[PDB]
Every structure is written in structure tokens, then in C-alpha cells.
A paper describes a structure:
Nucleotide [name], the modification site of [name], is located in the hairpin loop of helix 72 (H72) at the 5′ boundary of domain V in 23S [name]. The [name] structure consists of a discontinuous MTase domain (residues 1–46 and 99–280), interrupted by a helical subdomain (HS, residues 47–98). The structure of [name] is the first one of an enzyme with demonstrated monomethylating [name] RNA MTase activity. There was no detectable MTase activity on any of the mutant RNAs or the single-stranded DNA. These data show [name] is highly specific to adenosine at position 2030, requiring only a small hairpin for activity.
The [name] structure was solved in space group P21 with two monomers in the asymmetric unit related by a 2-fold non-crystallographic symmetry. The structure suggests that [name] functions as a monomer, consistent with its behavior in size exclusion chromatography. The final models consist of residues 2–280, but with residues 53–55 missing in the second molecule. An extra helix α9 and strand β10 at the C-terminal end of [name] distinguishes it from the canonical class I Rossmann-like MTase fold. The location of the inserted subdomain is novel among AdoMet-dependent MTases. Comparison of the structures shows that one molecule in the RlmJSAM structure has the same conformation as the RlmJAPO structure, whereas the other molecule takes the conformation of the RlmJSAH-AMP structure [root mean square deviation (RMSD) of 0.2 Å over 280 Cα atoms for the respective comparison]. In the open form, motif X does not approach the active site, and instead is stabilized by interactions with strand β2 (R47 and Q49) and helix α5 (residues D123–E130).
Numbering used by the authors: 2 to 280
The structure:
């Protein structure tokens, strides 16, 4: 099968999501003991950029394109950008890695991957990406159900990355319920949830519901390319991290101003790091 095309891959949201994922993975690697990378909605593995037609078009033009060849790239972005460069060795943007391939190139020999994807184009492509990589288990199954089935890991260490559908009200609720079930089984796991800002009120409710679980130690990192609106698509996105590694808050405070300056040259929107639930 041919690699999956995507119009959104490598956009400002992916830049934020993958900056955070890489920093968490690098922290987990500071202990020589094994850990698990669990991706509930793993997608195809990699995406072709630029569209199937002759013109080079896609949101990557306002995302990864604006940072990957900067000479003053912050040190916190090196691990991530080096993965992107690996899939684009000619020096032209043609492919963008999904979270599973970020994980594949950053994890060590002793670490494990557990990946789920239901889509009939994406799943077979994902399986092909991990042929003969025995560290990975790739299944065509419901993502949220893995938080019950696969936690806690035998290693008792891990990053759980949740990058779910947000198409209806029940989608936003499924996120909080799933996290609660995982946390019940694996309270010391690091949970990283990506969310879009299309309607702020849905996000407010989601965060309210998350606070209500009683879960502590919840960090929020958000980057907005525009001010909230009712009449745009996605104006912003963020990462909510439960049990963030010791350095993450500091690392993000260090890189967000640079990231926002490069991703949003007009200076609109905002970039924030704060705690939803302290402690």
C-alpha cells in the first residue's frame, strides 16, 4: 500500500504534541529500566505531505516547515527535529512522522510499544511500519479499551499518549472516562492528552470533568495561533500531562516563546504553561 496522505500532518498542533512527546520520552530514558509507550489512536505511522496533486499545499507549511531548518533551534527540540530529518534526508519536506514513529526512533532496545488503530487504511500501513520490530505490538482495536486491557505495564513505567477523535460531545467525555480507567490501574503512568480548541466551552467542560476525577499533578501546555473564536476552525491546541516529568514545566517555559514566535510570526494568540491540578 502507498503511504497515507494528510492535509493536517505537521501543523502547529503536531509540532506542539511531538515537542512534548519527545521531551517526556527523553526523561523516561534517564532510568536504565524499561518502559512502555502506549498509543491509543496510533494512525498510519507516517504521512505524505503536500497533497496528491502537483502543488505543495497543506498545514505543514505553517507548522514544521517554519522550525525544522532554523539555525537557532533550541536544544529542547533536537531529538524531535532529528526524527523529522531522518524521514526527509533530501532536505525537502515530503513525509511527516506519526507519534508511533517518533516513539520508534527514540525508544531503546529494552522498551516496548503498544499501538492500536481501527481505520482500514491506517492499520495495515501501521503494521507494515513495525514488521520485525519485535518491541511493538500493533492491534486493530478500540483505543480507549486498551487503557483497561494493557495497564499497568509489566515494566511499571510508561507514557500513555492519547490523541483521540473530537467529533461529537461523547468524544470529549470518552477522553476523561478513559483516563480515569487507566489511572485507576496505573496511577504512576505519564498520561499525555492532545486537545484542539475549536470551541473553548467544550474544553472548559472537559477540564472541569478532569478535575472532578480527583486526579492530581495535571499540567496544561497550550499554544494558540489566534484568539478564541466561534467562527473559525481550530485556533489553538494543547497538551494536558498527568504526572509530568520533573523538568517538563521548565523545558516548556524555555521553548514556548521561541516556538510561538516561529509558528506565529504575526504574534497573535498566546502560549501558556500552567497547572490544572497542582501537587
Amino acid at each position: 500500500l502507498s503511504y497515507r496522505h494528510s492535509f493536517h500532518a505537521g501543523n502547529h498542533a503536531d509540532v506542539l504534541k511531538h515537542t512534548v512527546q519527545s521531551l517526556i520520552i527523553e526523561s523516561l530514558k534517564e532510568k536504565d529500566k524499561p518502559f512502555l509507550y502506549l498509543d491509543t489512536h496510533a494512525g498510519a505511522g507516517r504521512y505524505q505531505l503536500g497533497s496528491e496533486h502537483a502543488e505543495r499545499t497543506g498545514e505543514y507549511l505553517e507548522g514544521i516547515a517554519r522550525i525544522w531548518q532554523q539555525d537557532d533551534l533550541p536544544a529542547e527540540l533536537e531529538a524531535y527535529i532529528n526524527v523529522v530529518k531522518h524521514f526527509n534526508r533530501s532536505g525537502q519536506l515530503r513525509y511527516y512522522p506519526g507519534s508511533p514513529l517518533i516513539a520508534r526512533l527514540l525508544l531503546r532496545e529494552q522498551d516496548s510499544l503498544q499501538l492500536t488503530e481501527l481505520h482500514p487504511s491506517d492499520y495495515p500501513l501501521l503494521r507494515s511500519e513495525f514488521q520485525k520490530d519485535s518491541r511493538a505490538r500493533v492491534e486493530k482495536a478500540d483505543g480507549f479499551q486498551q487503557l483497561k486491557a494493557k495497564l499497568p505495564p509489566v515494566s511499571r513505567r510508561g507514557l500513555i499518549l492519547i490523541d483521540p477523535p473530537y467529533e461529537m460531545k461523547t468524544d470529549y467525555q470518552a477522553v476523561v472516562s478513559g483516563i480515569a480507567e487507566g489511572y485507576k490501574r496505573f496511577a504512576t503512568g505519564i498520561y499525555a492528552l492532545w486537545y484542539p480548541v475549536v470551541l473553548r466551552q467544550q474544553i472548559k467542560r472537559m477540564i472541569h470533568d478532569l478535575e472532578a476525577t480527583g486526579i492530581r499533578k495535571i499540567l496544561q501546555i497550550e499554544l494558540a495561533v489566534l484568539p478564541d473564536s466561534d467562527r473559525r476552525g481550530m485556533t489553538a491546541s494543547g497538551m494536558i500531562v498527568i504526572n509530568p516529568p520533573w523538568k517538563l514545566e521548565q523545558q516548556m517555559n524555555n521553548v514556548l516563546p521561541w516556538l510561538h514566535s516561529k509558528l506565529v510570526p504575526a504574534g497573535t494568540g498566546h502560549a501558556t504553561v500552567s497547572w490544572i491540578v497542582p501537587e
